[PDB]
Amino acid sequence: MSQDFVTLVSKDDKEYEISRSAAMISPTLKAMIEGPFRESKGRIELKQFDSHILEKAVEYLNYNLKYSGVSEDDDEIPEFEIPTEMSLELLLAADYLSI
Amino acid sequence: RPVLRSVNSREPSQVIFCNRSPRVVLPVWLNFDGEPQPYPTLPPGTGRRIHSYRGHLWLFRDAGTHDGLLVNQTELFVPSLNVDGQPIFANITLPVYTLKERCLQVVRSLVKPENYRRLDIVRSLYEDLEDHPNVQKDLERLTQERIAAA
Amino acid sequence: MSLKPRVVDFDETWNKLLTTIKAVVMLEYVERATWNDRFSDIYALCVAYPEPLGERLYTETKIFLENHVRHLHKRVLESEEQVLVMYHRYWEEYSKGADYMDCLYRYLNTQFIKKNKLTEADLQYGYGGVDMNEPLMEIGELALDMWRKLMVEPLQAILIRMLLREIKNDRGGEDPNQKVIHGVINSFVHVEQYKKKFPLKFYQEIFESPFLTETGEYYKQEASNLLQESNCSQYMEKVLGRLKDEEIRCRKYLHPSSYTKVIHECQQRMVADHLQFLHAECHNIIRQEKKNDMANMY
Amino acid sequence: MDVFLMIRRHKTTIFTDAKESSTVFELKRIVEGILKRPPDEQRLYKDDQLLDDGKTLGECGFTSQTARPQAPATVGLAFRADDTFEALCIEPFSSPPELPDVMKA
């Protein structure tokens, strides 16, 4: 029963809790929980990246899970809009997330 | 076709491309010349009957993201339509445009190529967001699928 | 860059990296403190924005791993099989060291290798061993590519002979712990290049030649001995039990294709060289039934 | 239905895949999947929506698209002894930064 959740954390400890089912879509989470496991035990503290950015980055992972569950491409899956303002920092969050 | 060959089993078949995404179906086949053969574009929601040609590399290039595209859950399309012409439906996956893919798409739409170098991202994030899909991309993918190999 | 320095964020990253990895080169218990050390290490490696910072990151990683493995090659200069299984343990904990490096390097795997570099293009930063000290690939891979013939060349010159002798000592004497032979030559052959292109390349190179050699050697030698002085009816049974026990040891250490092939091969070597005996005592037991030669013959 | 949430226990963002048809239990596991504090003994509500154990994440007001993928929603934090309401934390992500130079222009 491996937690069922991992914690991607933003700025001053704003913790987004991501279901294992989504988490595993990031090989990076899967590595981190196993490598420096004394530390990153389903915890990724990007304690500098902002919650509204991290939210979109992890929402992509959830969206990916939904898309996968859907399987047949689109069953009311919306357009994954990313405002320009997001992209700037979201790039780094996305890189760390590294699907 | 050169010593490198292309689709031998070629014939008009009862087909109806069912463009079922918000983007255009540019039907294309990597021809005998290793070259793209475009076909009539299906706008978003365009079910158009085709004399589709079996074995062909029927890549359906979208006018929205133009990515590596999965008609009927796969990059390759083939008829080919029979005496009547069911799917074949060229049912168009608008893919579930993921985080990095959707970032690529928005960076396509918004920032300029002159501003790709000026992009509000890292020098490496440039390539992380400056990618552009092509018709020859699906052409080569479907050419590999034609034989493909291990 | 915009968020922070994008080439010298490598500085703190290599600081954390060297700290932890030296804590986890073949040693030892990987303390948490260094766990969060590498959490923040790949923190700064992800936000480090690496054009060279990743190639130079795993550059310095390869450099320190080469240094530590040369330091360990400094430790292979020791006694007989004492340090042979010492070096068994050396890679036992050093593969673990590179492994938890890779656990420190797992999120770092996702970060700085897997996108556009040596990992995708081996003809750019150097070929697939690790690199020319601008490498971009995984880290246990580094340990293996820097450890292979530290195992192979200096150690196996005598270790393979010790292996052959004590395997032969199945008849009397003994190998190490009957998997420690298996574990040692697995450590050796594990740098069947980490993709594992072959299972025999280093298997052959390391042990399989003396393996096959002394297989045939001891087999047909004892075949001769038991033909001589065993009442060949009992030559049969003695060779059979002996071959079975030695093939058991070939299940102690084991390459599941090698020892099968060669063991049964040189058993046939033993048993295929006693000819007129066959029909002579054949028709004997046909007449004078003896289910040594009956059973052993059949 | 696979609700998409963050169960913020003191900012504890938990980007999860919970179950709408599942009861308030999943609201967590899982926190109660790990810690086993019952749903009625936690005010992990949908903006103070009293979540009886007979309620589901559907009856939690969440759906897979209410607690939605493209932005997983927030789950307030008030862990109670039995039902003694704790200070429930409804915490948004933040106000994101501004346009790159383009944005469009």
Author numbering:
A (entry chain Q): 1 to 99
B (entry chain V): 60 to 209
C (entry chain O): 1 to 298
D (entry chain P): 1 to 105
Per the authors:
The CRL2 E3 ligase consists of a Cullin 2 (CUL2) scaffold in association with a catalytic RING-box protein (RBX1), with the substrate adaptors Elongin B (ELOB) and C (ELOC) at its N-terminal. When associated with the von Hippel–Lindau (VHL) tumour suppressor substrate receptor, the CRL2 complex is the primary regulator of the Hypoxia Inducible Factor 1-α (HIF-1α) transcription factor. Activation of CRL2, in common with other members of the CRL family, involves a cascade of E1, E2 and E3 enzymes, which conjugate the ubiquitin-like protein NEDD8 (N8) to residue K689 on the CUL2 scaffold. CSN5 is responsible for the deneddylase activity of the CSN.
Having determined the structure of the CSN–CRL2~N8 complex, we next sought to detail any conformational differences in the deneddylated CSN–CRL2. To stabilise the formation of a complex between CSN and CRL2, we employed GraFix27 (“Methods”) prior to cryo-EM. We next resolved a cryo-EM map of the CSN–CRL2 to 8.8 Å resolution. Although the resolution of the CSN–CRL2 map is similar to that for CSN–CRL2~N8 holocomplex, we only observed partial density for VHL and CSN4. We then utilised cross-link guided modelling to establish the position of the WHB which lacked clear density, similar to the neddylated holocomplex (“Methods” section). Compared with its structure in the CSN–CRL2~N8, the N-terminal helices of CSN2 are shifted by ~21 Å towards the CUL2 C-terminal domain. This change in CSN2 in the absence of NEDD8, leads to a structural difference in CUL2 which rotates upwards towards the rest of the CSN by 20 Å. The position adopted by CUL2 in the deneddylated holocomplex, places ELOB closer to CSN1, forming a CSN1–ELOB interface. In the absence of NEDD8, CSN6 is dramatically shifted away from its position in the neddylated holocomplex by ~40 Å. CSN6 in the CSN–CRL2 structure has its Ins-2 loop dramatically shifted away from its apo-CSN conformation, pointing upwards to CSN7B.
